[PDB]
A paper describes a structure:
Here, we report an arthropod-conserved insect chitinase belonging to group III from the pest Ostrinia furnacalis (OfChtIII), which contains two GH18 domains that act without synergism according to enzymatic assays and structural investigations.
In addition, the structures of two complexes were obtained: wild-type GH18A complexed with hydrolyzed (GlcNAc)6 and an active-site mutant, GH18A-E217L, complexed with intact (GlcNAc)6.
Author numbering: 91 to 481
Write the structure that this text describes.
């Protein structure tokens, strides 16, 4: 019971190098209440593996089992397998949801797939259903999934498989694809993707996940905040306690058109340069932002948005730190939402050796501390970037 801490683990984090290298055993069993495995896949209309080393074969334990092995040390921990995401696209979801036969084919493939691999549930990450057909068919998919999960539980006399989904924060995306009252009814809980509010696809700097929109925001764009998105879902009929609010352990980066104009909503020429470990322009892991702040980068706290950004030369990154995360946890409690979701567990300072505070998982550890009252350790102090970094 209490607030949830829902952590996404991404299987491609296994390929990162040096400090970035992450494996299932790097997760502390007591860190999260739920771990979601990103991702499974779809083949011939049925739930399947993303990559062969997810599976256990011949002598060799796969990633699925290494993640689920965490439940031996913490029997209260729940695991789910996610299907979807950006690589997956939309066409495969369209075809799988379009007819009852295709939906049932997926569903009766999904139940044994999960049970045989000791998963406690399924997370749907269709990004995104769009238009009237998708809007109806998505509901039909969740309805028939929940239906079948309910029946299975009673027949096998085991706790029912959980059904969850990751959902968008953009008002237009929400309106086009989501019959919210029906969607919420069939889901156990809802992982609100409260990040990617801004990024290199825009011509000015903007924060990845502002709690509140800056005053320099046009009036369309002030809709783009964590606060506005979460309350929009409530207004549309989602129960507050089913809303698990996403928290990014990453930032979105820009290259400033002029290094002297570095505030939020400043002209940008494109994405920030790629980090060594995540190798993606416009994007940095939290521990990559830490490296910047520990090597000459300047830190700005925006008291309007209640989030920080960092500047180094013409490089600009909007990210979340221990300060903004704790304030967001207070906002979760003040609004009675269901808990925090994290994207991802593998981009926090999981080794505890990069950001300088010598605490493993400073960000997620802070979430657990604020929401579930569990200490990060005796002398675990937040990094005060205001004094540590430049200004």
């Amino acid at each position: 019971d209490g607030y949830k801490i829902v952590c996404y683990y991404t299987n491609w984090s296994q390929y990162r190098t040096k400090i970035g290298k992450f494996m299932p055993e790097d997760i502390q069993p007591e860190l999260c209440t739920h771990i979601i495995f990103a991702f499974g896949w779809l083949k011939k209309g049925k739930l399947s593996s993303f990559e062969s080393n997810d599976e256990t074969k011949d002598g060799k334990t796969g990633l699925y089992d290494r993640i689920n092995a965490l439940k031996k040390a913490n029997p209260k921990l729940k695991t789910l397998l996610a299907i979807g995401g950006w690589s997956f696209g939309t066409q495969k979801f369209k075809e799988m949801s379009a007819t009852r036969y295709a939906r049932q084919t997926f569903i009766y493939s999904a139940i044994p797939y999960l049970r045989d691999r000791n998963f406690d549930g399924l997370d749907i990450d269709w990004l995104y259903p769009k238009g009237g057909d998708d809007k109806k068919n998505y509901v039909l998919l969740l309805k028939e999934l929940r239906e079948a999960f309910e029946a299975e539980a009673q027949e096998v006399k085991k706790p029912r498989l959980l059904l969850t989904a990751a959902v968008p924060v953009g008002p237009d995306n929400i309106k086009s694809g989501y019959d919210v009252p029906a969607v919420a009814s069939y889901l156990d809980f809802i992982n609100l993707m409260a990040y990617d509010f801004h990024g290199k696809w825009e011509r000015e700097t903007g924060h990845n996940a502002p709690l509140y929109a800056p005053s320099s925001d046009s009036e369309w764009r002030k809709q783009l905040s964590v606060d506005h998105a979460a309350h929009l879902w409530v207004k549309l009929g989602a129960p507050k306690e089913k809303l698990i609010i996403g928290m990014p352990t990453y930032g979105r980066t820009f290259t400033l058109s002029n290094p002297n104009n570095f505030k939020v909503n400043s002209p940008a020429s494109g994405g920030g340069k790629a980090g060594e470990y995540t190798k993606e322009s416009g994007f940095l892991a939290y521990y990559e932002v830490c490296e910047i702040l520990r090597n000459g980068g300047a830190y700005v706290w925006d008291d309007e948005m209640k989030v920080p950004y960092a500047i180094h030369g013409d490089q600009w990154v909007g990210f979340d730190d221990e300060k903004s995360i704790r304030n967001k946890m207070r906002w979760i409690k003040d609004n009675s939402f269901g808990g925090a979701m994290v994207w991802t567990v593998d981009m926090d300072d999981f080794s505890g050796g990069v950001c300088g505070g010598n605490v493993k998982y400073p960000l997620i550890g802070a979430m657990r501390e604020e929401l579930r009252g569990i200490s990060r350790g005796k002398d675990a102090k937040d990094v005060d970037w205001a004094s540590v970094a430049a200004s």
